[PDB]
Amino acid sequence: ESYCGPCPKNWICYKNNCYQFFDEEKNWYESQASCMSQNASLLKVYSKEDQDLLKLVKSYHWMGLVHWQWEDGSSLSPNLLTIIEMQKGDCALYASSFKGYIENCSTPNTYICMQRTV
Amino acid sequence: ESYCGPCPKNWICYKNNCYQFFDEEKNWYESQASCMSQNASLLKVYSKEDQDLLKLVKSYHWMGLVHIPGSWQWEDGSSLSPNLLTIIEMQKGDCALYASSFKGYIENCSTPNTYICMQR
Numbered sequence A: 001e002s003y004c005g006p007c008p009k010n011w012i013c014y015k016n017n018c019y020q021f022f023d024e025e026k027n028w029y030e031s032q033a034s035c036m037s038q039n040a041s042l043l044k045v046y047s048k049e050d051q052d053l054l055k056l057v058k059s060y061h062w063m064g065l066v067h068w069q070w071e072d073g074s075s076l077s078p079n080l081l082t083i084i085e086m087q088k089g090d091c092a093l094y095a096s097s098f099k100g101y102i103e104n105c106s107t108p109n110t111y112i113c114m115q116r117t118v
Numbered sequence B: 001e002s003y004c005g006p007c008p009k010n011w012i013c014y015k016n017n018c019y020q021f022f023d024e025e026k027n028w029y030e031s032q033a034s035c036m037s038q039n040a041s042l043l044k045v046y047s048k049e050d051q052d053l054l055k056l057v058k059s060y061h062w063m064g065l066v067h068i069p070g071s072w073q074w075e076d077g078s079s080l081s082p083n084l085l086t087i088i089e090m091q092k093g094d095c096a097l098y099a100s101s102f103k104g105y106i107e108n109c110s111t112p113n114t115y116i117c118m119q120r
């Protein structure tokens, strides 16, 4: 047993990360700004074990991966995501299980915001 | 305060409730026993606000709602709140599957289904 967080009330907490799904479709840049306004960033995938809840995510959602590195400038670690071509573009949609579909950054999509606690 | 729980280590926490999805298909009675083995119960729906994450649940899963011939009641013996679930009959049964958004499908208790456990 343990506690999870800290997270704001409207976020799912899993292994001390906070996740929130946004159903209003936006391009990658507008989604990034939305997460920032919530003291967060777009989903960053850094651990298959500590983020194994992402195996259960359905549909396709902006994550913070750009052409590959994350918003915060950090690199994509190997053996975390299978990146699959789909549409010509420089952004990627998260899909289960641990897949990234390359997508046009200007195409509206739903998105996942995430806050790390440490 | 800003922490959620307590909950078992690898469960999801939301508004101080803990949830775990089980992909193994079991009948209602086996699912109930599985949650109890983990010091939990099958999903109980009490608030569309506190449990609005249930709007995002895909597919159908056992919850702790049973018919006692009476009315629909939860495992713990408490009553189903009105205006919470829309109950839809499509099989002869005394048990119910949760489906989004805030629906309960009457289902044969013996039919294997995936299930959701919950702890508070």
Ligand SMILES: O=C(N[C@H](C(=O)Nc1cnccc1-c1ccc(C(F)(F)F)cc1)c1cccc(C(F)(F)F)c1)c1cnccc1-c1ccc(C(F)(F)F)cc1
Residues within 6 Å of the ligand: A012, A019, A020, A021, A053, A056, A057, A058, A059, A112, B012, B019, B020, B021, B053, B054, B056, B057, B058, B059, B116
């Ligand atoms: O992924 C979407 N739904 C699955 C789903 O239920 N998947 C299953 C598939 N097959 C079978 C079962 C599930 C499943 C069933 C019950 C639970 C339970 F234990 F919770 F009870 C969890 C999973 C999902 C995944 C993680 C957490 C939750 C939640 F906790 F909210 F219930 C739900 C989904 C679908 N449409 C739009 C948006 C989403 C979505 C996107 C991001 C996020 C996140 F996490 F990033 F915020 C959450 C939801």
